[PDB]
Amino acid sequence: MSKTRVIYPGTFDPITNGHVDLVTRASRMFDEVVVAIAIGHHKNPLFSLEERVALAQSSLGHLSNVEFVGFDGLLVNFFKEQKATAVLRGLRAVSDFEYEFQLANMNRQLDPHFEAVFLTPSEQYSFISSTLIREIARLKGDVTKFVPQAVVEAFERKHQQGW
Amino acid sequence: MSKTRVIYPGTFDPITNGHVDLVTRASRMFDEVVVAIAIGHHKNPLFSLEERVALAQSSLGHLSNVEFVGFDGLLVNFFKEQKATAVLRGLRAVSDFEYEFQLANMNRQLDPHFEAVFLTPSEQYSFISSTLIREIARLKGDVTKFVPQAVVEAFERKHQQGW
Amino acid sequence: MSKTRVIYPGTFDPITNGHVDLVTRASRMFDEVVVAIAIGHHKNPLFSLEERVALAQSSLGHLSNVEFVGFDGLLVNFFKEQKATAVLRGLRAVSDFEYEFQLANMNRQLDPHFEAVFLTPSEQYSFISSTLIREIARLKGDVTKFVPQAVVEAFERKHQQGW
Ligand SMILES: [Cl-]
Ligand SMILES: [Cl-]
Ligand SMILES: [Cl-]
Ligand SMILES: [Cl-]
Ligand SMILES: [Cl-]
Ligand SMILES: [Cl-]
Numbered sequence: 001m002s003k004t005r006v007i008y009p010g011t012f013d014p015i016t017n018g019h020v021d022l023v024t025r026a027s028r029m030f031d032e033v034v035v036a037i038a039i040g041h042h043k044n045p046l047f048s049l050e051e052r053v054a055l056a057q058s059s060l061g062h063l064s065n066v067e068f069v070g071f072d073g074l075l076v077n078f079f080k081e082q083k084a085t086a087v088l089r090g091l092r093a094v095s096d097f098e099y100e101f102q103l104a105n106m107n108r109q110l111d112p113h114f115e116a117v118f119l120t121p122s123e124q125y126s127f128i129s130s131t132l133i134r135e136i137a138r139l140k141g142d143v144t145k146f147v148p149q150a151v152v153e154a155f156e157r158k159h160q161q162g163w
Numbered sequence: 164m165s166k167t168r169v170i171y172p173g174t175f176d177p178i179t180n181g182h183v184d185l186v187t188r189a190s191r192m193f194d195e196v197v198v199a200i201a202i203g204h205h206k207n208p209l210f211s212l213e214e215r216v217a218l219a220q221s222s223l224g225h226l227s228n229v230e231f232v233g234f235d236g237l238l239v240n241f242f243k244e245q246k247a248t249a250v251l252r253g254l255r256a257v258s259d260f261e262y263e264f265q266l267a268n269m270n271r272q273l274d275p276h277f278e279a280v281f282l283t284p285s286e287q288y289s290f291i292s293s294t295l296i297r298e299i300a301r302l303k304g305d306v307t308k309f310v311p312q313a314v315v316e317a318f319e320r321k322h323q324q325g326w
Numbered sequence: 327m328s329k330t331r332v333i334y335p336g337t338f339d340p341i342t343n344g345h346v347d348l349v350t351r352a353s354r355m356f357d358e359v360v361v362a363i364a365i366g367h368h369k370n371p372l373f374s375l376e377e378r379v380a381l382a383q384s385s386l387g388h389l390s391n392v393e394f395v396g397f398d399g400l401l402v403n404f405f406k407e408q409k410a411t412a413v414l415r416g417l418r419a420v421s422d423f424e425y426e427f428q429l430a431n432m433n434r435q436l437d438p439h440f441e442a443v444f445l446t447p448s449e450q451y452s453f454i455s456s457t458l459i460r461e462i463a464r465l466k467g468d469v470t471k472f473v474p475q476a477v478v479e480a481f482e483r484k485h486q487q488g489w
Contacts, residue, residue: 074465093261098419105453109471110462127268136273139237145272256424290431299436302400308435 009036013045018125058150086115172199176208181288221313249278335362339371344451384476412441
């Protein structure tokens with residue numbers, strides 16, 4: 001045995017109902033889940049690290065075995081620092097599957113202890129992505145069905161402060 | 164019954180022989196076809212709205228049941244304003260199919276009356292895209308086989324005025 | 327018969343163990359192989375033409391039937407200038423396959439003598455791409471397993487001179 005610790009890395013820009021489903025599903029199967037929010041220096045997110053962590057803590061903080069940490073650099077160095085059992089990713093489409101397969105094999109070559117496990121989304125979240133949500137919010141669409149209420153309000157406060 | 168009205172949205176940057184085939188095929192199956200040319204503010208097309216509408220009217224104006232309108236904003240708001248029966252898209256490749264499936268489901272959640280129908284291109288236009296045509300024209304290739312003659316001339320006049 | 331001459335075009339930014347495998351495999355099947363390094367004006371490579379040719383000559387110059395040339399413009403014009411039998415490409419993933427199929431058909435329409443042959447990588451290089459190697463090197467990862475030693479050193483000298 002040992003305590004199991006899975007990292008769920010992502011930009012979470014912002015967190016969606018799909019991410020919440022995956023982290024809830026993962027929190028039942030592993031002892032510790034780490035929502036790892038990739039800072040994105042030369043990468044350019046709409047929401048800051050602080051907004052993204054806060055939105056994630058607001059949707060998932062009710063789960064006792066879930067932590068929230070920002071990271072940058074090589075996912076495999078973060079994996080080693082965190083003493084993780086595995087990385088978790090969701091697979092929504094064929095393009096995700098092919099990229100994820102390539103990355104899992106590259107990461108296994110950089111660190112032979114590396115491991116990646118995948119979840120498939122429930123069909124009610126299969127069409128939701130952060131990118132599409134950003135696009136709908138920008139064009140003044142209602143994203144309430146796809147994201148937690150706190151994210152809806154953050155899109156309004158992003159508007160109010162400019163946008 | 165009722166009059167049927169399908170929207171064919173696209174950047175049409177520029178219109179190709181493939182788009183002409185799709186709109187001709189659609190004009191036989193529905194009472195009204197709307198060639199909906201997405202303006203592309205924060206999106207950056209090579210040809211202006213005016214050039215794109217004109218090139219489209221020159222290739223398709225001979226069809227009595229086809230209209231040409233520029234739009235911006237949420238495709239579902241345009242769908243509602245236009246009182247459309249459905250959106251039409253072509254599916255050339257697997258990547259188109261997966262994106263289109265995701266968008267149709269997202270749009271159905273924003274508007275339950277939304278509908279998307281798809282056409283597959285004839286094999287003689289299956290390899291043609293606006294993006295590839297732009298690339299060939301930029302590098303001084305002959306695009307005559309892939310686009311109407313008016314688009315060929317517009318590439319020459321884009322050159323002459325700089326390029 | 328006739329002497330056979332295949333072009334292997336790419337950005338080779340930088341050359342990887344995967345490219346070396348493909349060119350070695352091709353050099354056994356055709357009389358002449360041309361490693362054709364696309365300059366990339368409005369395209370933006372990390373390594374210059376000179377660095378890329380040099381890195382390629384260092385990994386592949388031991389093969390007597392392999393030449394190294396920079397090119398820009400239309401691949402079909404380069405194909406005609408070089409009097410080539412065919413273009414060679416590797417196919418790593420489904421997305422490569424669909425793009426390559428589209429390009430082969432477009433190029434056949436621009437030049438009916440055009441021809442494209444494809445190789446599948448050995449599984450030990452199936453997960454390696456230039457883009458991923460760039461990402462790992464930027465974040466200070468070790469790329470030694472994926473690229474020739476000369477490329478490793480070039481990443482160090484790219485660092486030292488800034489980065
Ligand atoms: Cl994203
Ligand atoms: Cl974006
Ligand atoms: Cl386009
Ligand atoms: Cl472009
Ligand atoms: Cl590249
Ligand atoms: Cl890059």
